[PDB]
Each structure stands twice: as C-alpha cells, then as structure tokens.
Amino acid sequence: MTEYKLVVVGAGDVGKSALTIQLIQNHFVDEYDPTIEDSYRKQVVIDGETCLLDILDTAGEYSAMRDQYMRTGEGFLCVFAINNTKSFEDIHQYREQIKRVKDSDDVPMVLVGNKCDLAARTVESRQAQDLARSYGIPYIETSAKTRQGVEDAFYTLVREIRQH
Ligand SMILES: Nc1nc2c(ncn2[C@@H]2O[C@H](COP(=O)(O)OP(=O)(O)NP(=O)(O)O)[C@@H](O)[C@H]2O)c(=O)[nH]1
Ligand SMILES: [Ca+2]
Ligand SMILES: [Mg+2]
C-alpha cells in the first residue's frame, strides 16, 4: 500500500506528541504525553487515496542515530507554538537539520503554528506566513486541543510529498 513516512520536529512542548496522538487516536493529550519518542501508523483516506501514514514523533541536539531516524522521513512538520516566541525562533535550526540529513534544500515540509486555540498568542500569523513563504513551504495553524487543522497539517504534508 501507498505509505507516507512523516516526521514531526520542533522545540520542547510545542505539541509534537499531542498533534501525533490527535491524528492517531483523536484524543487530546492533557497530562500523559508519551515523553519517549515512538512511531505511529494509521490507514487514512487523503484526497480520495487510501494510504498508510507512519508518523515518527521526535524529541525537542546532534546524534548519528537521530539522523538515522530522521533520514527515513519523506516529509517533515516543523512545529512551533504560537504562544511561545522562542519555539518560533528555533524553527530555523530544525529546518537546517532536515536539509543536512536529507542532503537537499527542497525537502517536503510544512510549517505548523500549533496551539491556535490560544488567542493569547505571541507569534502573529503574518510573521509565520512571511517565514514560510521565504522557505517556499505551506503554513498551517493547528490546535491539538480542539483538533482544528490537525489532519490538515499532516495531509498537506502528504500533498507536498506527492508533488515533490
Ligand atoms: N491549549 C493547547 N495546549 C496544547 C496544544 N498542543 C499541546 N498542548 C499542551 O502543550 C503541552 C506540551 O505538549 P506535548 O505534546 O507534550 O509537546 P511535545 O512537543 O511533544 N513536548 P516534548 O518536546 O517534551 O516531547 C501539553 O500539556 C499539551 O496538553 C494545543 O494545540 N493547545
Ligand atoms: Ca513512501
Ligand atoms: Mg513529545
């Protein structure tokens, strides 16, 4: 079956595990986050295509084994939290790590501004749109809490993989 291997990266506590578990289990993780990084699989229909997603949840430095885990990704979600400025600034470092590991400057990737249920945001949508457009990648706002945008972010990443 058609399989899309996706990897979720970004700074601590931006919601990588929460986005992943929302996609897989439709559940919002409140207190019990996996903390230990794992791989999750699910058969979904994306734009009429039945396919399998394998999602690797990553930890929020450099490791040869982490490169080995990341090298298997076909596409990447770079997640920040819209109420945490440092996590947005950190996006540059995660994108640099992907480019190195994939040996490419055009890796299928989506910028994810998570926690968009929080109207008390420190990163404005316009700033993230600017950054995304300068990278040449989509930008999607998500909430793992309300589930808004969650499937949109993963499926848009699949679309980027398809057209690469
Ligand atoms: N309000 C709100 N809280 C969220 C959202 N996503 C995650 N959270 C909360 O943010 C905290 C961090 O989430 P978590 O999934 O553990 O993030 P992480 O990026 O996996 N952290 P780590 O880097 O330590 O693995 C949790 O308490 C979670 O409930 C969201 O969209 N909205
Ligand atoms: Ca594949
Ligand atoms: Mg986590």
Curated annotation (Swiss-Prot):
* Catalytic activity of the protein: GTP + H2O = GDP + phosphate + H(+)
The PTM S-nitrosocysteine maps to: 116
PTM note says: Palmitoylated by the ZDHHC9-GOLGA7 complex. A continuous cycle of de- and re-palmitoylation regulates rapid exchange between plasma membrane and Golgi.
PROSITE patterns in the record = RAS
- Supply the CDD domains for this chain: H_N_K_Ras_like
N-acetylmethionine PTM sites in chain numbering: 1
Q: What is the effect of changing residue 32 to F?
A: Loss of interaction and recruitment to plasma membrane of PLCE1
- Look up what happens after changing residue 12 to S: In CSTLO and CMEMS; also found in patients with oral squamous cell carcinoma
For this UniProt entry, what is the primary localization, expressed as one broad class? membrane
Signal peptide range in chain numbering? none
The keyword Aminoacyl-tRNA synthetase appears for this protein: no
* One GO BP annotation of this record: defense response to protozoan
Q: What is the effect of changing residue 117 to N?
A: Loss of GTP-binding activity
One Pfam family hit:
Ras
Cell compartments where the protein resides? Cell membrane; Golgi apparatus; Golgi apparatus membrane
- List N-acetylthreonine occurrences by residue: 2
Q: Which residues bind GTP?
A: 13-18, 29-35, 59-60, 114-117, 143-145
| InterPro entries from the UniProt entry | P-loop_NTPase, Small_GTP-bd, Small_GTPase, Small_GTPase_Ras-type
Q: Which disease is it linked to?
A: Costello syndrome: A rare condition characterized by prenatally increased growth, postnatal growth deficiency, intellectual disability, distinctive facial appearance, cardiovascular abnormalities (typically pulmonic stenosis, hypertrophic cardiomyopathy and/or atrial tachycardia), tumor predisposition, skin and musculoskeletal abnormalities. Congenital myopathy with excess of muscle spindles: Variant of Costello syndrome.
User: What family is reported?
Assistant: Belongs to the small GTPase superfamily. Ras family.
Annotated protein name in UniProt: GTPase HRas
Organism of origin is: Homo sapiens (Human)
